[PDB]
């Protein structure tokens, strides 16, 4: 598995199943999966930062990012590739050393430029085929955790060590 | 695929899995799927208006339609066939030039009259046999996206063009 | 199918997948499936009343029974067999003309005494084996509708006649 | 195997790991009524049930109360420690505890109890620690599955309680 210095992740359709709950009062919900917090745990255990790119902008994601101690949160992003290219510049790494997981049209250009691209099994076929690794899980099922554990080559030895 | 000039759609059981969330206070929820927003994207990409016809009337659907910039919204509809005729009559459009997706008893008369009828895989057998194209997805799983993409013949080159 | 004069149904695990959403403030949610309203439609189309029996007692179910025009709503029920018995006395019918659907321990006694017992596929095996008809669907998937349509022999003819 | 105490994780056991956030700082969990049958059988056989969770919410406190769970420990940092405390207090060994958990912070405890349960949904390196097979995933009534297996609940038990 190639060398990774940064893990970037989309939210809707990755950390969730794409679900957007609306009530009558203008409030909104997302459903996260606690399993994906272990994706953060593994990244941080390995000294690798995690950044969230999303084109939505919600208090929902702000609070979830905070809860998970995510290193970067970029909301209302319209150009995901530009966002990553710039974060890479500030870190002095290149796209070949980023792992990005996304599921939709707005992710495609970034998925095509990164060192390892991941797309959940639930995503449209034309995005899915941009994946450079196989992911079994659908969004909301812990696919971000699956992506991280693959990208970082997390194995049983690592598991024994942390416990 | 025949020429389509208007895409119409039901909400519950199509944009959702039929889920209706009630609380203790009289509030109400629906769970939408961000994937279906690509249905609108593609429609608008090909210059095709989208309309929602629903028998329910909620602030939920009003706000959702607004967020997705849906072109026509009709709520509290008792006669979906009449509502589609009236909209179509305004636009100069024939029911044969309409693609409509619905999932239950109240959608049947319209489904039998449109140029392309779609029904999610989750729908009662009586309704699903009215579908004139095959849809794999269930309500809430992005079946509206699926419907639009097939109706408009969205292919890999369309995908390559928009990114 | 035998002659049925009353359809009775549990809520949790039948009309829902057994899910109970709790927030931080003491509020509560259930998720109903709009599909199950067709169960009430078909029952009423055949001149058969529907009654809810549940051990829970919530505003949630109160609203749902109202929205669906359910004929009878009994909540906080500690003994479902008795509750069904007095309602049967009150209506001048007996248990053999009742169709009941339930999914758990508190339903067991009533299920053994009704003319047609239904249990969702999702239920424990010891309850499931009391079903007197096969139900394919799980609670929350529209299994109440499946039950009513099977109990009343709803066929394509019936569908064609009501659209 | 002879059991004196059933302990259980929450998220990913009593739920599918789902955490709902709204825009206002509120939070939800989805429980399954099926799992209350877990408490029912436990109490029926005179076995107490305790909840160990690393989270801390009103959500769980209210669910535990509603289900009349015997023990509740939230914001737990070290689940092994929490369980030993309870075992010492009860005058029992971990060998007489059946525990079900689903993730890293359950591993230590899972490897020490007499019967360890892990939902089908759990990551594989946790799942392999299970000492009995559980078919069900978190949130599908897997706590009930566990109790029923651990206590050997059979049809005769069902006939008796009905
Ligand atoms: O389940 C509901 O809340 C209900 O209002 C009940 C009503 O009996 C039924 O006709 C409608 C219809 O299924 C929806 O309006 C379609 O959107 O649904
Ligand atoms: O999960 C619940 O909150 C609970 O109240 C717990 C209770 O111990 C159980 O017996 C009931 C019963 O399963 C429901 O009432 C079914 O409607 O459910
Ligand atoms: Mg996305
Ligand atoms: Mg519908
Ligand atoms: Mg029930
Ligand atoms: Mg857990």
Explain what you see.
The structure is a homotetramer. The first copy, chain A, is an alpha/beta fold. The first copy, chain A, has one domain (1-163): HAD superfamily/HAD-like (Rossmann fold, 3-Layer(aba) Sandwich), CATH 3.40.50. The first copy, chain A, is 33% helix and 18% strand. Chain A is built from seven helices and seven strands; from the N terminus they run βββαβαβαβαβααα. Chain A has helices at 37-45, 59-67, 80-91, 108-111, 125-128, 143-151, 156-162, and strands at residues 6-9, 19-23, 28-33, 50-53, 72-74, 98-101, 116-118. A five-stranded parallel sheet of chain A has the order 5-4-1-6-7, sandwiched between helices. Chain A has a two-stranded antiparallel sheet with strand order 2-3. In chain A, helix 1 runs parallel beside helix 6. The longest helix of chain A is centred in the middle third of the chain and has 12 residues, at 80-91. Chain A is globular. Chains in contact: A-B, A-D, B-C, C-D. The A-B interface holds A 12-13, 17-26, 29, 104-105, 108-109, 124, 126 and B 21, 27-35, 38, 41, 58-60, 63-64, 142, 145, 156, 159, 162-163. Bound molecules: deamino-beta-neuraminic acid (KDN) (2 copies) and magnesium ion (4 copies). Chains A, B, C: InterPro entries: CMP-NeuNAc_synthase (IPR050793), HAD-like_sf (IPR036412), HAD-SF_hydro_IIIA (IPR006549), HAD_sf (IPR023214), KdsC_fam (IPR010023).
């Amino acid at each position: 598995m190639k060398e990774i210095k940064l893990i970037l992740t989309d939210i809707d359709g990755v950390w969730t199943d794409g679900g957007m709950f609306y009530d009558q009062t203008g409030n909104e919900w997302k459903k996260f999966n606690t399993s994906d917090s272990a994706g953060i745990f593994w990244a941080h255990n390995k000294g690798i930062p995690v950044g969230i790119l999303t084109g939505e902008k919600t208090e929902i994601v702000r609070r979830r990012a905070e809860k998970l101690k995510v290193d970067y949160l970029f909301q209302g992003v319209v150009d995901k590739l530009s966002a990553a290219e710039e974060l890479c510049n500030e870190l002095g790494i290149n796209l070949e050393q980023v792992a990005y997981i996304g599921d939709d049209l707005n992710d495609a250009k970034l998925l095509k430029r990164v060192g390892i691209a991941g797309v959940p099994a639930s995503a449209p076929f034309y995005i899915r085929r941009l994946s450079t690794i196989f992911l079994e899980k659908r969004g909301g099922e812990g696919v971000f955790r699956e992506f991280v554990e693959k990208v970082l080559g997390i194995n049983l030895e690592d598991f024994i060590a942390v416990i």
